[PDB]
């Protein structure tokens, strides 16, 4: 009586997160999530998060149901979600170009929808870190804008309690987009703000992926992946470590970029969300009203 009311139409992806299918109900398109056997803890804390907050913004995906139901005759953990028809972010940057206008929506709704994550709202939600932000964990909407999925690593913290609610899943991040605190285990794991800098990392890497994708002067870069030139594909843990902690390697900004207002305004954003020292990092909050700002 939630899954039974639903149709899996068509499987849009297949990997280590499980499979999401594009499905029907009440004959109008959802998303629908299938988690892996091995991650029962991540559908648990998503289906936590979206029903006991009211999470509800229009740069996060949005939650309609969460269920479990038998097929091949197991358990099945079900996320269901409105559908995005563009797909991820990651998909959309290598099937196409952006102008100025359509790289600054991009980039200023992420940081939107992730400053709506770090804010404690009172009278309501209390403050949320990600955990695991990346290109393809982002959606791309008809309007142009983004919305950010995948909570399952999410750490919640409220002022009242002055509670940090870290969870219990054993999952990780995605190693490539991993802080150096976080490879080399010097995260302070009781302070939520080390949960939050860990995002603006992350959103960092994003930006720059981004920006990469926006034409001036005629020319542009192929998509690539932060750190394409230093690591393989499934980078390991230790191969992330040697490059972001031992190294100390950031992405590289490209030249073409120096002589482009709105592309040194993003050069100067990721550089202040890549400094070594968590501390040091702008706040999603600065950075939604530095992107407000730019033209
Ligand atoms: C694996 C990433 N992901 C995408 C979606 C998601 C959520 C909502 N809508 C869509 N739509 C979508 C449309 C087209 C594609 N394809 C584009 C062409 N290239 C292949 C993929 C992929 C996804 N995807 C979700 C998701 C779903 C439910 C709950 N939580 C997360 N995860």
């Given at each position: 009586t939630v899954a039974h009311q639903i149709t899996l139409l068509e499987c849009v992806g297949?990997?280590?997160?499980?499979?999401?299918?594009?499905?029907?109900?009440?004959g109008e398109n959802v998303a629908v999530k299938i988690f892996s056997s091995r991650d029962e803890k991540s559908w648990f804390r998503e289906t936590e998060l979206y029903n006991t907050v009211?999470?509800?913004?229009?740069?996060?995906?949005?939650?309609?149901?969460?269920?479990?139901?038998?097929?091949?005759?197991?358990?099945?953990?079900?996320?269901?979600?409105?559908?995005?028809?563009?797909?991820?972010?990651?998909?959309y940057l290598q099937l196409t170009t952006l102008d100025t206008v359509s790289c600054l929506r991009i980039v200023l709704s992420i940081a939107s929808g992730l400053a709506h994550l770090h804010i404690?709202?009172?009278?309501?939600?209390?403050?949320?870190?990600?955990?695991?932000?990346?290109?393809?964990?982002?959606?791309?909407?008809?309007?142009?804008?983004?919305?950010?999925?995948?909570?399952?690593?999410?750490?919640?913290?409220?002022?009242?309690?002055?509670?940090?609610?870290?969870?219990?899943?054993?999952?990780?991040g995605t190693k490539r987009y991993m802080?150096?605190?976080?490879?080399?285990?010097?995260?302070?794991?009781?302070?939520?703000?080390?949960?939050?800098?860990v995002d603006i990392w992350a959103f960092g890497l994003?930006?720059?992926?981004?920006?990469?994708?926006?034409?001036?002067?005629?020319?542009?870069?192929?998509?690539?992946?932060?750190f394409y030139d230093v690591?393989?594909?499934?980078?390991?843990?230790?191969?992330?470590?040697?490059?972001?902690?031992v190294d100390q390697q950031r992405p590289n900004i490209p030249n073409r970029w120096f002589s482009?207002?709105?592309?040194?305004?993003?050069?100067?954003?990721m550089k202040e969300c890549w400094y070594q020292n968590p501390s040091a990092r702008l706040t999603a909050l600065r950075i939604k009203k530095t992107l407000t700002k730019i033209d």
């Open positions: 297949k990997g280590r997160y499980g499979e999401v299918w594009r499905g029907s109900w009440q009211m999470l509800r913004h229009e740069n996060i995906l949005g939650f309609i149901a969460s269920d479990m139901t038998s097929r091949h005759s197991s358990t099945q953990l079900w996320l269901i979600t409105h559908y995005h028809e563009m797909g991820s972010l990651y998909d404690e709202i009172f009278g309501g939600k209390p403050a949320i870190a990600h955990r695991d932000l990346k290109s393809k964990n982002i959606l791309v909407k008809k309007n142009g804008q983004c919305c950010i999925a995948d909570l399952g690593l999410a750490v919640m913290h409220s002022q009242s309690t002055n509670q940090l609610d870290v969870g219990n899943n054993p999952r990780v802080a150096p605190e976080v490879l080399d285990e010097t995260i302070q794991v009781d302070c939520f703000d080390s949960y939050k800098r994003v930006l720059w992926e981004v920006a990469r994708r926006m034409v001036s002067n005629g020319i542009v870069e192929d998509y690539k992946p932060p690591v393989p594909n499934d980078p390991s843990f230790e191969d992330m470590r040697k490059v972001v902690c482009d207002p709105t592309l040194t305004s993003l050069a100067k954003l």
